[PDB]
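Researcher: I've got a protein sequence and the SMILES for calcium ion. Could you write out the 3D structure of the bound complex as structure tokens? I'd like something to compare against our soaking experiments later this week.
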Amino acid sequence: EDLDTDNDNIPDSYERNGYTIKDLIAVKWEDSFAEQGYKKYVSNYLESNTAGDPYTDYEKASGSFDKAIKTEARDPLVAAYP
Amino acid sequence: WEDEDLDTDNDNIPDSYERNGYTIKDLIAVKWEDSFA
Amino acid sequence: EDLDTDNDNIPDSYERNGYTIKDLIAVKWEDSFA
Amino acid sequence: WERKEAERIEQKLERSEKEALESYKKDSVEISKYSQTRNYFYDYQIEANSREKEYKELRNAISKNKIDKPMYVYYFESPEKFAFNKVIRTENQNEISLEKFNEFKETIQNKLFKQDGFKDISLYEPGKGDEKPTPLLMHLKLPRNTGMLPYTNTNNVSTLIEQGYSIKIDKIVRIVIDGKHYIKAEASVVSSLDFKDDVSKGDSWGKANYNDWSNKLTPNELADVNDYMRGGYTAINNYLISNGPVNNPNPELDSKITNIENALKREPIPTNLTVYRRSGPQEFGLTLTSPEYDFNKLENIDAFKSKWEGQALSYPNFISTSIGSVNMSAFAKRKIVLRITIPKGSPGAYLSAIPGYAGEYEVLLNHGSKFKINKIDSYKDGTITKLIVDATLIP
Amino acid sequence: SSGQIVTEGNSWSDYISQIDSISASIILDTENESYERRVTAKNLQDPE
Amino acid sequence: SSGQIVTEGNSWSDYISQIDSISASIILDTENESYERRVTAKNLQDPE
Amino acid sequence: SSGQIVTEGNSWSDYISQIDSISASIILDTENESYERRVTAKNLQDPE
Ligand SMILES: [Ca+2]
Ligand SMILES: [Ca+2]
Ligand SMILES: [Ca+2]
Ligand SMILES: [Ca+2]
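Model: Sure. Here is the predicted complex with calcium ion in place.
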């Protein structure tokens, strides 16, 4: 629906089921997106920083952090960590 | 949507202007025209 | 007129054509002022 | 450096403003609400309010410091302040549709909106760590020589200003901040002359601007206008309401109308001015016994705003209005106050210029005058909720 | 906010890595002066 | 005010005395690891 | 205006050049005592 418990601008059902970012807005995942190069993300809907790193789930998924960070650290389950 | 009043990144330039081409005159972004060159 | 594009308290036409300051207000230049 | 400047500016404040600012740090909402609607009372309550000294010292402290250049400010505003009764989006939704954007754009095409209270603003864009209570963001360009008081908070620094102008919105675009859609509006301040409570200052301005106006009138027309405003203004207005020249033409009053119109046209208002007139239900096509005159239930106010706000106006008669806004016993029972902004160069004259009791600082406007209503707000008046209309005179 | 130029607290090291990560480096040598540039390049593996 | 973790200015010495004043200390020795804990205890002389 | 006086950060050097630029210097030399003063003087080349 539209609940956002942790205030990370991703709906709870989106985090629970799967989502991706396009135009800097989270959208529901669809299997046809994988053919266009998109990735499917899931994360903790009760925690703003699922991996415990200084970047929130939205910032990681949207790539709205330092561009020098590796692309695998863009999903919420892999920590950005030197 | 269907108008040139979108600034998604909030940098004072419309999205379609950045997508297609623009120039600055009087400190305001305007649509590019070939006669400007 | 009254346009001030750069927000420096001097109108655009005044900057283009010439001006002077009296009583801390920019006024249009006149040859008799010299 | 900003913290040092704030400390420097707050050090030179004297004590009374010091506790005023300290009290503002905990009771901001009530002080702002009181300052918004303070000048619509009688002369008694304004001096008798428990917060009048608070507001006076806070206003003095704000007006102590002024800026020498135009500069931009950023703050979040509710769309309801711009006469938009719908919702752009909920606080949990992420995106705004094209339809809501189009409706909001249509609502604010050609209008001016007045802001008349204290406000906390920012000199920097609202980045991370700030608050986003409304989906509307304002980019406002403040004019030169306006009050601005930077004060240090517990951790950050914030700035407070006093709104005394009317703003217009040029362009609106949809932006994204942290995965949510907002509306960013570029607005500009339109200057006007307002005497909220300085009725003495307004009267002095009227004297200085119109005392010599009578000397420019030919003696026959001057005596004509004097005698008419003295005794027969009621009859002339009553004749004008009934569309007298259309139904029963007669030159004995057409000559009066022409003379009054020419006298008003002789000397126009030199600077943008705001005038307050206590209107009646009969003007708005209602009666005292009408159920809609009860502005206590929310339904009546909502229906009145739905059917009247944003529309036009037309007065066949002449309009008499007072520079001051304080209520008087003459119009105590009137629940509607009309706030009119007079554009520079429009016809009109200060009746109170002539000696004697020429009226309650009365100002006359030409017949058939039309107005545009921008927004409507309601303020409490004792045990009843009165209503305020913001209007702009148009040529 | 006042319109003055400030350089304290503005560090190029905060941007060196980010600029190097998303750019290509081009050098022109000539004979008397050398020029070094970075030009932004598109990542085709990212649809966004 | 943001989601960032801050450690500067947060000293444990501001809480050591207060924690020790109102708690009992329990230690479990085990074999290859020791555990020390503080558990809050009620003061029966204070009705509040 | 509340009687508080602060002297930290109020440097005289910020005004020495400005005062010396627009003033004339007068010195009175009496017995076992001396006085130096600065008095503002008009500039006749500036109409403002
Ligand atoms: Ca969430
Ligand atoms: Ca989350
Ligand atoms: Ca843009
Ligand atoms: Ca200028």
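Model: Residues 15-20 of chain B form the longest helix (6 residues). The first strand of chain B starts at residue 22 and ends at 25.
Researcher: Great, I'll pass this along to the crystallography team.
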